[PDB]
Curated annotation (Swiss-Prot), chain A:
Keywords: DNA replication, Host nucleus, Metal-binding, Transferase, Zinc, Zinc-finger. Its main location: host cell. GO terms for biological process: bidirectional double-stranded viral DNA replication; DNA replication. It is found in: Host nucleus. One of its GO terms (molecular function) is zinc ion binding. GO terms for cellular component: host cell nucleus. Essential component of the helicase/primase complex. Unwinds the DNA at the replication forks and generates single-stranded DNA for both leading and lagging strand synthesis. The primase initiates primer synthesis and thereby produces large amount of short RNA primers on the lagging strand that the polymerase elongates using dNTPs. Belongs to the herpesviridae DNA primase family. The chain holds residues 409 to 888 of 1058 of the full protein. This is DNA primase. The record marks D180, D182 as: Essential for primase activity. Associates with the helicase and the primase-associated factor to form the helicase-primase factor.
UniProtKB/Swiss-Prot annotation, chain B:
It is found in: Host nucleus. GO terms for biological process: bidirectional double-stranded viral DNA replication; DNA replication. Belongs to the herpesviridae HEPA family. Disulfide bonds: none annotated. This is DNA helicase/primase complex-associated protein. Signal peptide: none annotated. Pfam families: Herpes_HEPA. It comes from the Viruses. Changing T226M: In strain: Nonneuroinvasive mutant HF10. GO terms for cellular component: host cell nucleus. Changing A430V: In strain: Nonneuroinvasive mutant HF10. It comes from Human herpesvirus 1 (strain 17).
Length: 357, 687
């Protein structure tokens, strides 16, 4: 079973914070509150590796007391004055911690974007369905509603808006479970079969999340799991890349690359036990290692939804929760950055699961 | 030999020169005399080579008279040989008292002078109301342009203090004082003195604050001499550190004042900045050009000035007796010591056990613990044994020591001077030996009297000891205090060690629980009314004083259990400490540690151009950390990568673990050392 696997093959260590300590930990160890909230334009530093190394050099000239992606990921400090990243960014009102992004570029070459706020409308409004459409959709079965809403959908300064990878920062706490599916398949898989496969993936994943996070109320009915699906009603699919993003349950927060590696491993064992899941995903897929766990370490960058690869955009597939209460609200979260960023602000006491062994 | 009743405010060293001489030299000394106005006289002294060597430590006179390059612009001569200047000033202050007579500061004085020569020949005590010593504020700040490269000087001398490096750089390149913006404000009220300096060379009044005076002397030398001085008016000393700022201000003062033909003073200063490895106490000695001290609470500074002729703290141990005169007096004071205490001194080792004491760890429970102290007992014994050994040695330094000893109970400044004087009066092994032996006999007397007045010593030194009883209780403690006082007095008088003021044994606490985990680490507690005491926990920073508070709270509760529950309280206390620490995870100076020039961090090159902040580092380096940052060498506020609270917390937790393991073993007998799981839990807060 999955209970036996989380009794014999995991050693969970959690530490409880409370009162001002919990709020301080959340503020210091996640992105700033305004970071992932939409903005008109973007402030931040975005350039190639050479240009960014040069500007970091010209930003440490102003850093007299102490002192490429290990360093961008390291510039996080505010105090009661403008933060230390305000020298690289040159904008004096940034607030830290702030997102750091790796950016593939045509024809080759890597760039970085360390920026505080950004218009996420420019990135997500081509796939943000109308509330009138969602309400007017007619479709009582949740599987059917999800499939139809899925049906309806539709310089570094230019390349970060079509290609973007969030870089994992081990100094930051983790408020979402961002999995990375790698579905190999000899035979193409029809879209409704895949949608049912995701619908059975979610309940095994939610059982795993319940096991790992005891003090919680993770309901396998309405807990929001956010699936995005790279395009290629099928993608004319012949590897399919998914992306499952989950809120870490409210009292908990995860710390450590090893810890989320373990979390992904436990969810993979949860899903490769659901007898109703290995029917759908089975008979098409060569392998069965459905999750890459070596993606969570300090410095690895994972592509973000509504972005392509240099080109299959991770546009959402709405695997709507069964017994979900507010469908418009659920549809209205695939576009918010805070549901698919590692280190987002979470949405009293907290518990940090800092070890699984 | 005309006599006037005047009061000297400062004895400063004006000239040093050799006659047709080989084994001696002469000096001309400047008196800032006053009356009911001020006047400026001088005295001639004569110091031989033997006296110089005695005050030095064994060197030559031809080397204390070729420090007559100090009448020039090169302004940091004692940096070449600080001990030479200490010795010269002390030996001139001894020769002056030996030739003219008893000279004292701020006291009414009958002062003579030979009209043919002009110099003071004899000085005697007198009677009268002296002027109330005046003062003048001094806000000195300057921009000395010293090129970071200070890296070189610290490269030759690894553990050097950056104030010393700053002064050595100025000495290497003098014109940095002649091109340095400077802002000075002297407020005596009689005439306000602000000034404005783009470069110190470039342009009330200087005449409204001092008087330029020319006096015609004819010492015994080759011809008539004219000594020009700056006589203070309506103030006797400046009160304020930027020592290069003072040096540059006084150096341009010397240049402007003395650019006309007549002899120029010494222009020499001494401070803890002038030694490579610094000095724990700040001061700014003026033993040269200007004339009057610049003290760096001010009541204590003035009083220590008056008591020790202003030689302290520049001279050091030379206030009391020459350093080459200490073996003779130590052996003499041992000869006039009983044979038993002779042998006790003969076997004094800094680690030998005299009294059987509680072995760490130990715990005395609900009994009447005490904490007894003979205040300044080492100073009293030093003074008394020095009087006893004065047959081996003239006694004016002993008089200064005696005045400090008899003033210490009423003046805390005398206590501070004694606490910085006895540790350096010999540090000269014979005085360590004799003091240790006399203390050993005192410890034995405390033992022997305790065995009769219902007492048992459980720790301490002999001058600061604590112990338990066999018993209303206040009465027996009073009896023990009185009996031990009388016993130490009788045993001290048997050894002819006669103390200036009768021994007082202070009851520094009547406590009801005590736990000991090391040679100095002890915690005391009073259940009947919470009044603890904790000694031995390091206080190297604000984090350490918060840790001491945590440890004291924890020990209160843990002894309130009157062992696993004790471990629970200790671990929870560590929990709370780490949480509150993370609340202060960003404050740099909170996690700073003060490290001496003697314990082992590298100096980042950027710290080597923090400007004038480097000149306020004479003794301590205050470092946060895993890369170390000397916080005070940077402006404010500090941009900083998140301070490594793991390292600093591990430090603090190891001291707390010492304390807790000691307590657990002492009270209940648990051999298990208290170890906090830090990596297992609470390490993640700073990863």
């Amino acid at each position: 079973n999955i209970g036996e696997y989380v009794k014999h093959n995991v050693t969970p260590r959690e530490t409880v914070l409370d009162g001002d300590t919990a709020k301080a930990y959340l503020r210091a160890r996640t992105y700033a509150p305004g970071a992932l909230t939409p903005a008109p334009a973007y402030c931040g530093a975005v350039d190639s590796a050479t240009k960014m190394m040069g500007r970091l050099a010209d930003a440490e000239k102003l850093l007299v007391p102490r002192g490429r992606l290990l360093r961008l990921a390291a510039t996080e400090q505010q105090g009661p004055t403008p933060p230390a990243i305000a020298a690289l960014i040159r904008n004096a009102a940034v607030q830290t911690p702030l997102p750091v992004y790796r950016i593939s570029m045509v024809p080759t070459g890597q760039a970085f974007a360390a920026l505080a706020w950004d218009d996420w409308a420019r990135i997500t409004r081509d796939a943000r369905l109308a509330e009138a459409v969602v309400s007017a959709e007619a479709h009582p079965d949740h599987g059917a509603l999800g499939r139809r809403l899925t049906d309806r959908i539709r310089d570094a300064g230019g390349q970060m808006y079509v290609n973007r990878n969030e870089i994992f920062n081990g100094a930051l706490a983790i408020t979402n479970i961002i999995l990375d599916l790698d579905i190999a398949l000899k035979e193409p898989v029809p879209f409704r079969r895949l949608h049912e496969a995701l619908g059975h993936f979610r309940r095994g994943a939610l059982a795993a999340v319940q096991l790992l996070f005891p003090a919680a109320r993770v309901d396998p009915d309405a807990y929001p799991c956010y699936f995005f699906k790279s395009a290629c009603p099928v993608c004319s699919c012949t590897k399919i890349g998914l992306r499952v993003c989950m809120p870490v349950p409210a009292p908990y927060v995860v710390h450590g690359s090893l810890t989320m590696r373990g979390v992904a491993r436990v969810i993979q064992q949860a899903v490769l036990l659901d007898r109703d899941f290995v029917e759908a995903i089975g008979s098409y897929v060569k392998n069965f290692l459905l999750i890459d766990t070596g993606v969570y370490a300090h410095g690895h960058s994972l592509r973000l939804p509504y972005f392509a690869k240099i080109c299959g955009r991770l546009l959402p597939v709405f695997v709507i929760p069964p017994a979900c209460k507010d469908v418009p609200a659920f549809v209205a979260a695939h576009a918010d950055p805070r549901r698919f960023h590692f280190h987002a602000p979470p949405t009293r006491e907290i518990r940090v699961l800092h070890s699984l062994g | 030999i005309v006599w006037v009743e005047e009061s000297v405010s400062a004895i400063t060293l004006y000239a040093v020169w050799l006659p047709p001489a080989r084994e001696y030299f002469h000096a001309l000394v400047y008196f800032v005399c006053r009356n009911a106005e001020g006047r400026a006289r001088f005295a001639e002294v004569s110091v031989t080579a033997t006296e110089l060597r005695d005050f030095y430590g064994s060197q030559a006179v031809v080397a204390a008279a070729r420090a007559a390059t100090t009448p020039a612009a090169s302004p940091l001569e004692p940096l070449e040989n600080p001990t030479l200047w200490r010795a010269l000033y002390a030996c001139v202050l001894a020769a002056l008292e030996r030739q003219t007579g008893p000279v004292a500061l701020f006291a009414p004085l009958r002062i003579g002078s030979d009209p043919r020569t002009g110099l003071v020949v004899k000085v005697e005590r007198a009677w009268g109301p002296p002027a109330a010593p005046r003062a003048a504020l001094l806000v000195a700040e300057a921009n000395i342009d010293i090129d970071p490269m200070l890296a070189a000087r610290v490269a030759e001398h690894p553990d050097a203090r950056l104030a010393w490096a700053r002064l050595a750089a100025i000495r290497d390149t003098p014109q940095c004082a002649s091109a340095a913006s400077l802002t000075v404000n002297i407020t005596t009220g009689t005439a306000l003195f602000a000034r404005e300096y783009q470069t110190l060379a470039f342009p009330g009044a200087f005449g409204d604050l001092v008087e330029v005076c020319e006096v015609g002397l004819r010492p015994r030398h080759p011809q008539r001499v004219t000594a020009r001085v700056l006589l203070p008016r309506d103030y006797d000393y400046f009160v304020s550190f930027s020592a290069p700022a003072l040096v540059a201000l006084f150096r341009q003062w010397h240049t402007t004042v003395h650019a006309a033909p007549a002899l120029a003073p010494v222009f020499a200063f001494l401070g803890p900045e002038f030694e490579v490895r610094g000095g724990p106490v700040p001061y700014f000695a003026v033993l040269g050009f200007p004339g009057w001290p610049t003290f760096t609470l001010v009541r204590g500074a003035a009083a220590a000035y008056a008591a020790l002729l202003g030689a302290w703290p520049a001279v050091g141990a030379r206030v009391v007796l020459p350093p080459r005169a200490w073996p003779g007096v130590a052996s003499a004071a041992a000869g006039c010591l009983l044979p038993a205490v002779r042998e006790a001194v003969a076997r004094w080792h800094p680690a030998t056990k005299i009294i059987q004491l509680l072995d760490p760890p130990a715990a005395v429970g609900p009994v009447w613990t005490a904490r007894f102290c003979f205040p300044g007992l080492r100073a009293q014994l030093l003074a008394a044994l020095a009087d006893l050994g004065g047959s081996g040695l003239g006694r004016t330094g002993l008089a200064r020591l005696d005045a400090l000893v008899v003033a210490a109970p009423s003046e805390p400044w005398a206590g501070a001077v004694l606490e910085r004087l006895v540790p350096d009066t010999c540090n000269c092994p014979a005085l360590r030996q004799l003091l240790g032996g006399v203390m050993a006999a005192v410890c034995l007397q405390i033992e022997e009297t305790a065995s009769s007045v219902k007492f048992a010593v459980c720790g301490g030194d002999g001058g600061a000891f604590w112990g338990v009883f066999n018993v209303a209780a206040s009465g027996v403690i009073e009896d023990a205090r009185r009996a031990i006082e009388t016993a130490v007095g009788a045993v001290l008088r048997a050894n002819a060690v006669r103390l200036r003021h009768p021994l007082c044994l202070a009851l520094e606490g009547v406590y009801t629980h005590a736990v000991a985990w090391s040679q100095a680490g002890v915690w005391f507690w009073n259940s009947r009314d919470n009044t603890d005491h904790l000694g031995g926990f390091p206080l190297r920073g604000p984090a350490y004083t918060t840790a001491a508070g945590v440890v004291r709270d924890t020990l209160r509760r843990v002894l309130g259990l009157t062992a696993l529950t004790a471990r629970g309280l200790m671990e929870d206390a560590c929990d709370r400490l780490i949480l509150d620490a993370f609340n202060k995870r960003l404050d740099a100076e909170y996690w700073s540690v003060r490290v001496s020039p003697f314990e082992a961090d590298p100096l980042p090159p950027t710290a080597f151009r923090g400007g004038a902040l480097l000149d306020a580092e004479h003794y301590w380096r205050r470092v946060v950390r895993s890369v170390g940052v000397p916080v005070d060498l940077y402006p404010r506020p500090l941009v900083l990568p998140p301070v490594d609270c793991a390292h600093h917390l591990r430090e603090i937790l190891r001291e707390i673990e010492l304390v807790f393991t000691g307590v657990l073993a002492g009270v209940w007998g648990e051999g298990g050392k208290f170890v906090y799981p830090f990596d297992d839990k609470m390490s993640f807060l700073f990863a």
